[PDB]
Amino acid sequence: QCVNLITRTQSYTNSFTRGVYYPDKVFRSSVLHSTQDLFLPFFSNVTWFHAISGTNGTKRFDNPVLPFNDGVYFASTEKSNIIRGWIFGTTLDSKTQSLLIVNNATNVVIKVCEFQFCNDPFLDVYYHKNNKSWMESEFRVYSSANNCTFEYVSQPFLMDLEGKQGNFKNLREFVFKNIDGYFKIYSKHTPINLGRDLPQGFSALEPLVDLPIGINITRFQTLLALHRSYLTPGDSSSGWTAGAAAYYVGYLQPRTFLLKYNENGTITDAVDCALDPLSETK
Amino acid sequence: GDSTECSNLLLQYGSFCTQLKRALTGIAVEQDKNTQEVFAQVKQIYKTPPIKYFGGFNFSQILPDPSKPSKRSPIEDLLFNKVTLADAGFIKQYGDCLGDIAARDLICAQKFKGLTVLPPLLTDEMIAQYTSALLAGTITSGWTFGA
Amino acid sequence: GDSTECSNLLLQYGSFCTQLKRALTGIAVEQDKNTQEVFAQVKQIYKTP
Amino acid sequence: STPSALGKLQDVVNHNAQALNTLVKQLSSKFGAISSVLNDILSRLDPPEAEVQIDRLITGRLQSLQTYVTQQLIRAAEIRASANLAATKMSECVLGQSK
Amino acid sequence: EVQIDRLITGRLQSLQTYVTQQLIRAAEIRASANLAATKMSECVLGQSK
Amino acid sequence: CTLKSFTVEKGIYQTSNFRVQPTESIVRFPNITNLCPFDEVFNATRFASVYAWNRKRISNCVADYSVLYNFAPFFAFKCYGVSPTKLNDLCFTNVYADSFVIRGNEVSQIAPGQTGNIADYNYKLPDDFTGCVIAWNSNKLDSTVGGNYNYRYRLFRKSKLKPFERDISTEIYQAGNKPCNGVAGVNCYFPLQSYGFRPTYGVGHQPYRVVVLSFELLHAPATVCGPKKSTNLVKNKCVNFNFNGLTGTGVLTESNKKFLPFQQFGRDIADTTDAVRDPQTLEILDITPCSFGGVSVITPGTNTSNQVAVLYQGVNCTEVPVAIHADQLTPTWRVYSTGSNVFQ
Ligand SMILES: *[C@@H]1O[C@H](CO)[C@@H](O)[C@H](O)[C@H]1NC(C)=O
Ligand SMILES: *[C@@H]1O[C@H](CO)[C@@H](O)[C@H](O)[C@H]1NC(C)=O
Ligand SMILES: *[C@@H]1O[C@H](CO)[C@@H](O)[C@H](O)[C@H]1NC(C)=O
């Protein structure tokens, strides 16, 4: 059965200078090299989907499947106990290939398959005392899975810290893009002090993975998990507990960028060209 | 670069390389001639007197500084610092005189691309010495040293 | 002309346009300098009696 | 204090440096060839077919070198005019009193 | 694309020749303008011997 | 010889350029070596139709071209961006093997950047295709006495296909209110057509298997490499090197650069390879081409003397021993000898 469980509310925030990443894996140092790539334009809109998960009163669906456009930029402050992956696809059905990314507490699984599921994807996890380690069932939450074609396993992208400061530090800036047959996914995790949203400053998104598929994506979705204290009961309001599963979404656009690599070969600064006349002059 | 085939096919094109080398050699000897015509306007090098008193006109900032090794004047030092420097063929055992790894490598890359800067015939020290001779002649001799 | 198809091939030849535009801009600012040096030899405008 | 006091000599240095940088960037220009690295072209195509590509690259780089040398000659004539002016100024203002 | 490349090379060479001849005659104009500034200083702003 | 005269006047003449020649050739590859699945391409029972061209990905292998060394009766190795004999000298990354079966005479329609009905509605090759095409007759297996009409090509589409684009949408283009219902007529044309593989047709019109090999060269970490013999590397010695297809000459010193784990090539302001990661052991080494510089001859007039001095411009005196010095040539007093008389 498909059940919506999130209190998705859309607010608008500033993009600032977030989303900068590495174009290609070519070391460069002390160079103001200029590129022409898809990027999150400076000072754009951010659709902050502020929400509380585990809310049984939201049975009817109230969250849309966000589009992909020219590359979705993502940010959040949720641990693997709350947000557990991402979904991509053109029609998000068994007719077109659906890409599922799952971030287990011990590993990461990336799959491309004709998964059948509704517009409310989630993963309910709990360690019942019978076995102390309960494994989720694909057939229960997900209706079907046919002609799986790709599989990849690695270390977790979410090295979540148990501390609240570390929980806020989990800025999983996972830029997703598909160009030249490459589905490039980047990542970051900043020890920046806790705030309210993406802060000031700069952070280059190192290339986390370059999946060799690079197919077009029409819709983008966020995979959330129902956070629990592992002692709560099952299917009840006193079961899946309320949790602020806030996640922000932005969109990339083609743009010329002027980068700035530091001594260690990392992008330490970047400017958009068409933001304002000062940017074009620079 | 170092490819033999490209050089052989460049030979098929005639002698633009010879003409360009001749033109650049003319430019270089022209630079040396310019320096000689501007600065080397006196046969003799003139030494400023040890006691540098000239009626109150203080030339200390334009006269050479005996303290610093460069012997340039303080104004000359300011001018040297203000302008971006250039290679001067330092002996660093780098194979290409001066160079470093992960540093100001623009000159090194230019050299490795075939572009080279030849040192002036008169070193900056000897150019400064020529200027010091000119200034000493002007201060002590006036205009009579140029005729 | 008004064509991107030619511009894509045009940018392949490098920064030749940068050099040409820089040379022309230098020529123009040199014309301004010429007029300023020939005519603007004073910074006070004098009224004819 | 003022950084624009020595603008003329810094402009001369910047002109030389940017001419050299333009020459260097001409290496990356393909000029209609399949690539811009001679070693890669030679390792990819045999001389009978690589001759056309290397000839296009040679023509492009030779045009770049010739334009560089011609503009160097023009600005060297400018520098020679300025140096003749400097020699005249040393003769008439330094070696004498010009009226 | 080949024909447009040929036309681009031709027009670029024409423009480059135009810019070089403008540079040469601009050096000529600059020599004449330096002479004119000298004449303004020594004939108009003074008496030249 | 340079002055084109027998009398040479007193002066310095820029004679030539001296470059210390390389000492040895060293070729490197990752220590892992695997048989590339190229054979499975040539061992495939059948290839997909041209409208639904089969695509295979080749990566993380060593290019074992023995299949085209021993048994290569293929008619055209029509390589475009590379020479067929040079494949062993270069490494590739993310190799794409497209494959289909077409008419033999239609090869001119699959030329790089060519335009045609199949090139617009079946399979558009890019205008800058950097790869090869291998075509060979398939009448032995892909032809039938009754007519091999199984292969079908998409004859018509509303818009031209993009380069390297596959479209399997079979929606009809109804230009009017009349429903097609499979009827060919007014405002209703089927977008697919069976191949005319009639037995009476001779060669050229018969089915031929075509494999298009597309390569992207050296801008990404290499995954497909040649079968060349991996050797050892030496430091501070100007040697030839072929690092995964990157050919050059120079010294390979130990680099103190802080490469990020995903980074392979380091580049300077002149965007040329200044450092490289050894494919066998992932460590970064700095590349520096061996010393070189101008060589000028300082001589008095040949009317006066015949002894000459030599200036090596901008080079440390530790790179002098080339084949002009007395230690490398016969002890003749015409030019220079004694080993000494070196001034930095
Ligand atoms: C397998 O993939 C094809 C796409 O080529 C798709 O049409 C099909 O539905 C998938 N599943 C099966 C069982 O063939
Ligand atoms: C960056 O490089 C500097 C030296 O240039 C070094 O001290 C510093 O530790 C480096 N930073 C990192 C994160 O490695
Ligand atoms: C003569 O000149 C010296 C310096 O050369 C100076 O110290 C001295 O006072 C002068 N004598 C005079 C002006 O009577």
Author numbering:
A (entry chain A): 14 to 295
B (entry chain A): 739 to 885
C (entry chain B): 739 to 787
D (entry chain A): 935 to 1033
E (entry chain B): 985 to 1033
F (entry chain C): 296 to 639
What does the paper behind this entry write?
The entry of the virus into host cells is facilitated by the S protein, which forms transmembrane homotrimers protruding from the viral surface. It consists of 2 functional subunits: S1 and S2. The S1 subunit includes the N-terminal domain (NTD) and the receptor-binding domain (RBD). The primary function of the S1 subunit is to attach to the key receptor, angiotensin-converting enzyme 2 (ACE2), on host cells.
